[PDB]
Ligand binder design. Structure first.
Ligand code: HEM
Ligand code: HEM
Ligand SMILES: [Mg+2]
Ligand SMILES: [Mg+2]
Lengths: 89, 89
């Protein structure tokens, strides 16, 4: 069941956005446009460039971001990963 | 100049890695060294051999790879396609 209020992106569409002109990334089943965040990230640009257009959930959690960082991610949230591209829990 | 965190490859060079000794492939503007991946590819070696050395984004996405297949590709990423060789738009 897709949610009328949410815009969904297939991982194929996220994979296209892997350039400095447009960088998207998936974190926990949600899509973030970090294009403008790249030069402001306190963890630097490179870690984000390397996984541009991809699901970087594991790296994000391995680093262990703070509640403050998670709060900050909300400003870049743009949609949910299409139901079909979500993995079983 | 470009981005020093990125090694760039011209499609002319990528095209030469089309045998089992060294097979590279392009997916969404990035180069992947699949030489060790061939044996382990669930869809078999032949489908990779067929587009070895070329951009196989279309066939990759048309097949419908899973989130796990995408995660798996990351370890083979060696660099980006030279900007001159990408689509103009
Ligand atoms: C919109 C998503 C993201 C936001 C808002 C964000 C935000 C931040 C912030 C605020 C910090 C400072 C320390 C703290 O608050 O925990 C930080 C550090 C860091 N971030 Fe992120 N980050 C994001 C995504 C990522 C991703 C996807 C990666 C990995 C590919 C990453 C890798 C790092 C690293 C390596 C550090 C350094 C911390 C350490 O020394 O271990 N971040 N990030
Ligand atoms: C780094 C590049 C690639 C990786 C890591 C990869 C990985 C995988 C994995 C893990 C599967 C199992 C099903 C799934 O998880 O989706 C799979 C299946 C398959 N792959 Fe690939 N693949 C790659 C490139 C390609 C390319 C370029 C082609 C086409 C020329 C291809 C054709 C197939 C086919 C036909 C299947 C079977 C589909 C099924 O019924 O699930 N793959 N691949
Ligand atoms: Mg060499
Ligand atoms: Mg994953």
């Amino acid at each position: 069941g897709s949610d009328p209020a949410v815009t969904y992106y297939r991982l194929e569409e996220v994979a296209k956005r892997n350039t400095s002109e447009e960088t998207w990334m998936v974190l926990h089943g949600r899509v973030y446009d970090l294009t403008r965040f790249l030069s402001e990230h306190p963890g630097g640009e490179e870690v984000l460039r390397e996984q541009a257009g991809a699901d970087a959930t594991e790296s994000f959690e391995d680093v262990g971001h703070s509640p403050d960082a998670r709060e900050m991610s909300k400003q870049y949230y743009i949609g949910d990963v299409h139901p079909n591209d979500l993995k079983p829990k």
